[PDB]
Ligand binder design. Structure first.
Ligand SMILES: *Cc1c(COP(=O)(O)O)cnc(C)c1O
Ligand SMILES: *Cc1c(COP(=O)(O)O)cnc(C)c1O
Lengths: 750, 746
């Protein structure tokens, strides 16, 4: 349910394995001995989260017993304890002794006060020596992934010189109890690890492949280690890793099964010291980097949209990774800790993926890099660009669009749209100084051309954009807001809904306002293009524009033969609970732009969809009547495959549980009860809520709130007096509800 | 040379998660299912290739398939021809065969022929005696084979045979070193054959199966089916679930454990699973050909391409690209016998192109990992590793002795506009404050309106192409440099050219006067050394060095547009080395990411930065895009920057001087310069261009070069070949030879 805090003061490593029977428990045992036996407050925390084959086999007990033996051999006293916390029923009967689980009281503890401490813990145990996923259901005893991660998070905090080993169960891709592959299960924590390879044969292959399936889940591996079989397996391994990761070779394990193994551990102390130090150096080097990243960023970056004179080192957020909707954020100020923070600005409104879907995309992207890299677009065809165009045409552009034009970002797509619109215009009306018509407050990107479509303001003065001119007729939009339980309208200095759905309703078009609008609008340098930001003015302050007003404006502009541009860079692809705002405005454009969420938040890519007619206006025999706009990476396979995936994933009820019965809409994500309350709060002007967006309007008092929300594990950037939480199309309502609860609690604390 | 693989008939690799999984049993089952049929078509053929084979001759998968099919032919009562060949083996292998003998070719063959019957054709290409790893056997038995030799051998076998099905059985796991030490999966990559994966029913087998699959996927391969042997663990359920049932998982019954069992009845018990597996791979090929065969047409109906007049493009000129491997497109043609073939990307895809096959594969993982670790992570006031690493590499290389700040954008166009805004500030602060830039007519700086304003009026700026253009600059005409008939000459409007001594010379004074002799000019913007889009004209560096010094003397900010030249395009990391002067502002993109993904930087001086400092959040630089500093591009550029730069990874970097070596053959160059149709040749770094004296004549040449496996887009009368920073001179030489040959044929 909630965000984790992982202490980073002490190193904690996963013990991964290419397969089973490679030595994994032997490796934990060697690390521990190397660390506990030297010449006080020294502690090795050994966790075997999942354990099958219990109780006849028990890696906790193995480590436990083997260290007791080594402590005598090496003549260095230590304390030791082994615990097992839970097991299925059949496991607990084997010892003599819910979700189908049993708690246990099982502990051994040969204590020796003041001596280095060994602390072994098995968290959950089953009986059959099979994959955890089979045991879970055969013994009708299971554990949820988050429960497993909470259990471990609890153990870590409970203990934090110090070292922690978390031993996996099976290969890197073995299903855990719930069927979730082991490598996806531990991903939220993103712990560094070591991989126990295979010295055998086919072992080079199995080792490289396990390593790759880890890498491609975002993990770091401090060392690969394996058991000598006389094949010199280490040479191809070291070469593949370009010797950036050390490969350690343990001597052959005795084959005689009655072997205590004591002398082998002694023979191997060298390799185990080396392995222990590598994971000690690796952590130290990682902390030194983390601890210097804020400062160095302040000296080396020039950030967009930030007045550097004002940013002080303490406000530079250090992000170490992301897992779905959560940043993993480093704080030195704590006990040096990585913790989760919900990305509530959705990172410049790009954000979409689930943890599940993030992992999926990563492979889809790896594969696309390896198959295509970047491949020249003009006059060419390759699969991911073709697939993407087909998905765009058959969804977002279903009943109007017939051509797809690729660019790099929202800004380029918009400029491409402006050029197309002015042609369909200078061809129907034969052609001249051209201006657009827009709604003051709409935002359309930062390149000069997209800048000209925005109304004069401070952001357009001579200092911010020297070549600005303001090439448009900017009308002031009526807006819609939610206050004290009901949706109102707020007309411009010129000029109560039951529910939010009434607003978007077709019957509303025959009403009074529709006439009042048609006149005020009709009543208005040649206007050669209509450009709107459908339903919502994003950058402008999360104002919901009256859809009726824009539906009417569109129909007017088309009646007078003016091309209509829908700027859906912000709204497109489930941001607002639909694939296209076309569905909400009830009218179609001639031109439309998409980006941001098009790639599901992973990589830049922009499309400008066009009508068959808009296209024809660029047809002729002169290569000069063509559209001469293009960038080097236009239609890059990377972004295209990524968009082709995201489009289908966001859309499919199988993969996106937020998708409804009808397939055309997201279920309501933000709690109705809370939404009322936050809007009826003596500090809120208005609330705008729809799809994945929740915003409110109230200076300082807002920056107070943010400081407070950061404390709750919610990162968010304010739009002046507008505070917004924005999730992804796949984010669960339970997550959103928690967001609103935290906002509401902090909101009363003034 | 470039390969041509027939695609008329399906050819699949047989990959394995490990060894001892059944691999040879799977080939054997496919072949039986395919050869033993009711049609008994005389022209039915299964080509079985075991390219690499160790443990020879006591074990021999060719012989296994061979013998086991003979057996099944009797059992199933359907006659067939069969033959087993071994083409090469180490010495120790050949002695084991008696043959009274560091590779050598054997005549060894057995061929129980039965005319008119379905044909089995088994071929082992290279064999080692020792039952050890191929990379170990190769050196222990002083007998090796180059990767390209192995691929040529296979290409030769395929052409020699192409109803029909072809199985190529791997040796070991997907990542087992081949004879040369190259991992098996990287070895077959250039061919990019589809395949099936033989998984592991055992235990740890789900893990090993997923991981083998993933190391395949992450080398760009497609897998039609996963198949494995039942061990009672129901391994197939997690597998099917991970693949979201988009790839079928087939489960064979347990193989008999008794070692003397001839397995005949198991193959019979398994015919169901083997039919299924044979159909899946026959259908995956059919579905792949249907797609391929409809891509050009559909592209014509669905795309709106940049820079192309659609009325003129016909279906027949739409190039179908199926993949790329380093510098080579793999291009589909139905006009052939439906064939995938290699074409050198000589336009470097809009001048973005860099990676080696080796480096392409490397970047792919680097990117997979970055997607999985970061996705996209909010930039302003934040820090994450790949962006920090990238900025450090930029500052310490490309901006070493002048730059102190790095600003991220999406492409060249956005970087340039960002640069323009920065320059006008350092200007409107030194001179206290209508602003125009000063540029060289012909320089190109991107297609967004602001970058458009820095380009001199032309047809591409008329009211139809850009309605809001204005031409906000003073455009001077550049002196150029060309190579003609063996010598470099100047055209007023090779090491000697870039030399510092040349600055004290005549021209330097003549230049200093004309430029000094020239609405407020508030920024200098050049495309250093080469005007790319403009026609691959080399601008006299002395002329630009002088212009820069002139503009700095009058307190005008200098912008270097290095989006095209940056990062080894022209044989150096920065044209700063070549011009011998430093900017205040510079833009990078295209090759910055090593040709993989968009990303742009605008490097700035400490001073240019300071002009945006104050207490008002309005004096800040208010330009930014949603994906600014995306971890994807950043990690990718952080890699590329180091890889292109390092003699260890880039063999074109000369080991002692740590610069790029010369790539374009001396002779062939003069020969094209001497040619009479050629006006000029410009050559430097990874670039070779020429202008003809007559554009039909250029389009004629391209048609002809495509025929030679060289794809390239013309700049009117300028024809250019452009390789990557890592491309071998041997490859380049071949390019020049083909251009020269076609150049005489007029
Ligand atoms: C973000 C946005 C753009 C521009 O996108 P970038 O990729 O940041 O240039 C244009 N229009 C709208 C409505 C947007 O939200
Ligand atoms: C390609 C290029 C640009 C612009 O790059 P895009 O990413 O295509 O916008 C700017 N200047 C020069 C010299 C270039 O070559």
């Amino acid at each position: 349910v909630s965000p984790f805090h992982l202490p980073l003061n002490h190193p904690t490593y996963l013990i991964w394995s290419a397969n089973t029977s490679l030595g994994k428990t032997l490796v934990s045992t060697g690390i521990a001995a190397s660390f506990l036996l030297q010449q006080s407050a020294t502690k090795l925390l050994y966790l075997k989260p999942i354990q099958t084959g219990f109780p006849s086999d028990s890696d906790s007990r193995f480590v436990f017993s083997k260290l007791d033996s080594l402590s005598l051999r090496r003549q260095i006293p230590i304390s030791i304890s082994n615990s097992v916390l839970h097991s299925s029923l059949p496991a607990a009967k084997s010892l003599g002794l819910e979700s189908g689980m049993c708690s246990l009281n099982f502990r051994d503890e040969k204590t020796v006060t003041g001596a280095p401490e060994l602390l072994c813990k098995t968290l959950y145990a089953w009986e059959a020596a099979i994959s955890p996923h089979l045991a879970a259901e055969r013994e009708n005893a299971t554990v949820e992934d988050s429960v497993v991660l909470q259990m471990i998070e609890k153990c870590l905090k409970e203990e934090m010189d110090l070292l922690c080993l978390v031993e996996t169960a099976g290969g890197v891709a073995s299903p855990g109890p719930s069927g979730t592959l082991q490598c996806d299960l531990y991903r939220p924590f993103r712990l560094p690890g070591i991989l126990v390879g295979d010295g055998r044969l086919g072992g080079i292959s199995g080792t490289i492949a396990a390593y790759e399936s880890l890498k491609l889940r975002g993990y770091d591996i401090a060392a690969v280690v394996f058991e000598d079989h006389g094949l010199v397996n280490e040479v191809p391994l070291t070469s593949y890793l370009r010797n950036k990761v050390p490969v350690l070779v343990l001597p052959p394990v005795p084959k005689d099964p009655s072997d205590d193994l004591i002398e082998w551990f002694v023979e191997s102390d060298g390799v185990f010291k080396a392995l222990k130090e590598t994971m000690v150096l690796a952590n130290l080097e990682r902390l030194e980097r983390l601890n210097g990243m804020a400062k160095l960023a302040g000296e080396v970056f020039w950030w967009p949209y930030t007045q550097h004179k004002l940013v002080h080192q303490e406000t530079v957020t250090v992000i170490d990774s992301r897992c779905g909707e959560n940043f993993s954020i480093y704080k030195a100020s704590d006990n040096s800790s990585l913790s989760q923070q919900f990305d509530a600005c959705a990172s410049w409104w790009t954000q979409g993926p689930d943890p599940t879907f993030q992992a999926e995309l990563a492979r889809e992207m790896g594969y696309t890099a390896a198959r295509f890299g970047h491949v020249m677009f003009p006059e060419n065809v390759y699969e991911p660009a073709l697939k993407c165009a087909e998905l765009l045409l058959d969804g977002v552009g279903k009943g109007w669009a017939s051509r797809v034009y690729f660019s790099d970002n929202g800004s380029t797509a918009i400029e491409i749209a402006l050029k197309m619109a002015f042609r369909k215009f200078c061809v129907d009306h034969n052609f001249i100084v051209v201006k657009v018509i827009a709604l003051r407050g709409s935002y359309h990107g930062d390149t000069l051309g997209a800048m000209e479509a925005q109304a004069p303001s401070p952001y357009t003065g001579f200092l911010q954009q020297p070549w600005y001119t303001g090439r448009g007729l900017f009308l002031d939009p009526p807006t819609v807001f939610l206050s004290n339980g009901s949706w109102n309208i707020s007309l411009p200095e010129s000029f109560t809904f039951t529910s939010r759905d009434e607003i978007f309703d077709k019957s509303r078009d025959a009403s009074t306002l529709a006439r009042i609008y048609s006149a005020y609008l009709s009543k208005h340098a040649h206007v050669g293009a209509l450009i709107i930001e459908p339903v919502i003015h994003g950058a402008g302050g999360m104002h919901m524009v009256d859809p009726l007003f824009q539906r009417v404006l569109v129909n007017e502009c088309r009646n007078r033969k003016i091309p209509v541009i829908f700027d859906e860079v912000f709204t497109g692809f489930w941001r607002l609970g639909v694939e296209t705002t076309t569905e909400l405005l009830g009218c179609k454009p001639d031109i439309a732009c998409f980006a941001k969420l098009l790639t599901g938040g992973m990589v830049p890519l922009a499309v400008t969809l066009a009508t068959d007619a808009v296209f024809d206006s660029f047809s002729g025999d002169s290569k000069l009547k063509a559209l001469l706009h293009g960038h080097s990476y236009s239609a890059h396979a990377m972004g295209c495959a990524t968009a082709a995936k995201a489009i289908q994933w966001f859309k499919d009820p199988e993969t996106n549980h937020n998708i409804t019965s009808q397939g055309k809409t997201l279920r309501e994500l933000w709690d109705e009860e809370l939404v009322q309350q936050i809007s009826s709060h003596s500090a809120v002007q208005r609330v705008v809520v729809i799809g994945t967006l929740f915003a409110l309007e109230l200076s300082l008092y807002a920056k107070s709130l943010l400081i407070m929300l950061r404390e709750d594990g919610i990162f968010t950037r304010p739009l002046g007096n507008v505070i917004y939480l924005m999730c992804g199309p796949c984010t669960s309502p339970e997550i959103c509800r928690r967001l609103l609860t935290k906002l509401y609690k902090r909101l009363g604390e003034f």
